[PDB]
């Protein structure tokens, strides 16, 4: 798609077999999604940004569909108010910024 930026870049994702909404975030290194029940092994990690850091669960090699594009990679699960797709999965689906 050609995602425009007049509105929030919202897409449907599928994680843990469940459909959710998420925000495509070129300004995030990582992918972090709202606390959820997710199958798979995980380990603790901190991730940061404005206002400081939050503690999350780091799940490796998680299957996740982004607007119908398949990715399998690292998904952080924690206290974010919004599901954000970051560069680790944006690169997997071949996303670029263009102007």
Ligand X SMILES: CC(C)(C)NC(=O)[C@@H]1C[C@@H]2CCCC[C@@H]2CN1C[C@@H](O)[C@H](Cc1ccccc1)NC(=O)[C@H](CC(N)=O)NC(=O)c1ccc2ccccc2n1
Q: Which residue has the tokens 């929030």?
A: 8
Pair 64, 75: CB distance under 8 Å: yes
Nearer to a copy of itself, 5 or 19 (CB): 5
Among the listed ranges 10-18, 19-27, 37-45, 62-70, the one in contact with ligand X (CB under 6 A) is 19-27
Q: Is 50 in the site for ligand X (CB under 6 A)?
A: yes
Site stretch for ligand X (CB under 6 A), options 28-36, 57-65, 66-74, 89-97: 28-36
Nearest CB to ligand X, comparing residues 23 and 36: 23
Give the interface segment with ligand X, choosing from 11-19, 23-31, 34-42, 60-68 (CB under 6 A).
Answer: 23-31
Q: Are 61 and 88 in contact (CB under 8 A)?
A: no
Q: DSSP labels for 8-32?
A: --EEEEEETTEEEEEEE-TT-SS-E
Task: Single out the residue of 66, 86, 93 nearest to residue 25, CA to CA.
Answer: 86
Site residues (vs ligand X, CB under 6 A): 23, 25, 27-30, 32, 47-50, 80-82, 84, 86
């Amino acid at each position: 798609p050609q995602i425009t930026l007049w509105k929030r870049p919202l897409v449907t994702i599928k994680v843990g077999g469940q459909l959710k909404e998420a925000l495509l975030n070129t300004g995030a290194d990582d992918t972090v999604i709202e606390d959820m029940n997710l199958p798979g092994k995980w380990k603790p990690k901190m991730i940061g940004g404005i206002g400081g850091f939050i503690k999350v669960k780091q799940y490796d090699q998680i299957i996740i569909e982004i607007a119908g594009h398949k990715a399998i990679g690292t998904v952080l699960v924690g206290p974010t108010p919004v599901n954000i797709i970051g560069r680790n999965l944006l690169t997997q689906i071949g996303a670029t910024l263009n102007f």
